[PDB]
A paper describes a structure:
To assess whether Srr1 and Srr2 could support a DLL mechanism of ligand binding, we determined the crystal structures of S. agalactiae Srr1-BR and Srr2-BR at resolutions of 1.65 and 3.65 Å, respectively. An unusual feature of the Srr2-BR structure, not observed in Srr1-BR or in any previous structures of MSCRAMMs, is the conformation of the C terminus of the N3 domain. To date, the structures of MSCRAMMs crystallized in the absence of a ligand have the C-terminal extension of the N3 domain either completely or partially disordered. In contrast to other structurally characterized DLL proteins, the latch region in S. agalactiae Srr2-BR adopted a distinct conformation in the absence of ligand. Examination of the structures of the S. agalactiae Srr1 and Srr2 binding regions suggests how Srr2 might have greater affinity for the host ligand. In Srr2, the C-terminal latch of N3 appears to be pre-ordered in a conformation that might best be called “open, but ajar” that is poised to close over host ligand quickly. Although the cysteine cross-linking studies suggest that both Srr1 and Srr2 C termini are able to close even in the absence of ligand, the pre-ordered conformation of the C terminus in Srr2 would almost certainly require less time to do so. This would theoretically increase the kon and reduce the koff, and it could be numerically reflected as improved ligand affinity. To reveal whether the latch domain of Srr2-BR was important for binding, we generated a variant of the protein (Srr2-BRΔlatch), in which the terminal 13 residues of this domain were deleted. Removing the C-terminal amino acids of the Srr2 binding region abolished fibrinogen binding.
Numbering used by the authors: 230 to 545
Write the structure that this text describes.
C-alpha cells in the first residue's frame, strides 16, 4: 500500500520531442530563449498513493536553472484534476511523478504530458552545431538534434573595440530573484579613452521591476579566451575584484563603474548581479563615456508579465 515505482506497469506510452517555438528550425538560441517539447501519453491499470515513475533526461536538458529541483506541471484528468505531481531533480537529471488519490480510484487511467524543456546553460556553455537531446522512460526514448547559439556581444570600433553582452540566467520565480550576468570587453581588446570608460547597469523600461536598490553585484576579472557564451562558469578560478570596482546594494538604484582610461587586451570582466524582481524586468549594462554618447550596451527582457511559467491548460 505504501507505494512504489511503477514505470514497468505502463502501456501505450509514446514519448517524443520537437521545437517550433524556436526562431528558425533546427536551432536553439538562448539570448532569445526557445525550448524543446516532450510529447508523452500513457495508460495504466491502478496505482496507489505514493507510486512513482521517472523520465531520465540527458546531461544537458534543464527545466529551470533556478534552485536544484523544479516542480513541473502535474498530469491531469480530462476534467483538470490532481492526477500525479511532478518534480525535476537537477542532480539526477530526471523528472519524477508521484500519483495521487484520483490515480488510485480509477482503472482506465490515461495520462498525457506536454512539458517544455530547455538546454542547460551550465553544460552547453558555448555554442554547438547539432547537440543531442534525449528524454527516456521504459523502452521508448526520444532523440532530437538542435544547434545551440548565444547571440554575439555588441561592438563599435570605438575606444579600441568596445564590446559587451549580457543575459538573465536564473529566474527564482518563487523567491523572486534573478541573476543578470554581464561580460565587459568580450572581444578582449586593449581599449582606451581619455575622459574614461565606464559600465552601468540599470533597468531600461519605466516599468521594469528590478529594484537594484537591494541587489548583490559581484565582479570577476579574467581573459576573453577562457570565457563562456552562456556566461555561467566556475568563477573561483578567476580573480574577484568586486570590492574595488563597486559595492552591492547601491542607493542610487543603478550601478556605475569607472574602469579608468584603459582596459588591457587580456582584462575582461564578468558581472553577476542578483536582484529582487516582480511582474516584469528588462535591464542592460553599458561600456561608454560619462554620457553614453560614445559607447555600447546590451539589454535583456523578461515578461512573462503575469505569466508565462505555469501555463495551466494547453493542447496541440
Amino acid at each position: 500500500v505504501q507505494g512504489q515505482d511503477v514505470t514497468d506497469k505502463l502501456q501505450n506510452l509514446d514519448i517524443k520531442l520537437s521545437g517550433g517555438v524556436q526562431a528558425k528550425a533546427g536551432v536553439i538560441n538562448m539570448d532569445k530563449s526557445e525550448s524543446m517539447h516532450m510529447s508523452l501519453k500513457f495508460t495504466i491499470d491502478s496505482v496507489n498513493r505514493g507510486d512513482t515513475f521517472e523520465i531520465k533526461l540527458s546531461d544537458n536538458i534543464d527545466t529551470n536553472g533556478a534552485s536544484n529541483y523544479s516542480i513541473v506541471e502535474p498530469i491531469k484528468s480530462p476534467t483538470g484534476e490532481v492526477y500525479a505531481t511532478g518534480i525535476y531533480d537537477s542532480q539526477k537529471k530526471s523528472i519524477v511523478y508521484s500519483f495521487t488519490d484520483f490515480a488510485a480510484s480509477k482503472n482506465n487511467i490515461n495520462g498525457i504530458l506536454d512539458i517544455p524543456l530547455w538546454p542547460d546553460d551550465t553544460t552547453v556553455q558555448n555554442t554547438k552545431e547539432d547537440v543531442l537531446f534525449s528524454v527516456k522512460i521504459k523502452d521508448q526514448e526520444a532523440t532530437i538534434k538542435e544547434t545551440v547559439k548565444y547571440d554575439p556581444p555588441v561592438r563599435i570600433d570605438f575606444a579600441g573595440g568596445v564590446s559587451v553582452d549580457s543575459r538573465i540566467t536564473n529566474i527564482d520565480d518563487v523567491g523572486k530573484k534573478m541573476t543578470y550576468i554581464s561580460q565587459i570587453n568580450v572581444d578582449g581588446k586593449s581599449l582606451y579613452n581619455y575622459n574614461g570608460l565606464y559600465t552601468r547597469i540599470y533597468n531600461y523600461s519605466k516599468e521594469s521591476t528590478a529594484d537594484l536598490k537591494n541587489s548583490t553585484i559581484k565582479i570577476y576579472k579574467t581573459t576573453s579566451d577562457n570565457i563562456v557564451e552562456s556566461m555561467v562558469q566556475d568563477y573561483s578560478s578567476m580573480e574577484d575584484v568586486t570590492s574595488k570596482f563597486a559595492n552591492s546594494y547601491p542607493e542610487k538604484g543603478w550601478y556605475d563603474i569607472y574602469w579608468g582610461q584603459f582596459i588591457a587586451s587580456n582584462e575582461t570582466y564578468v558581472i553577476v548581479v542578483e536582484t529582487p524582481f516582480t511582474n516584469a524586468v528588462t535591464l542592460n549594462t553599458t561600456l561608454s563615456d560619462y554620457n553614453e554618447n560614445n559607447g555600447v550596451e546590451h539589454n535583456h527582457t523578461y515578461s512573462s508579465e503575469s505569466g508565462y511559467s505555469d501555463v495551466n491548460a494547453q493542447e496541440r
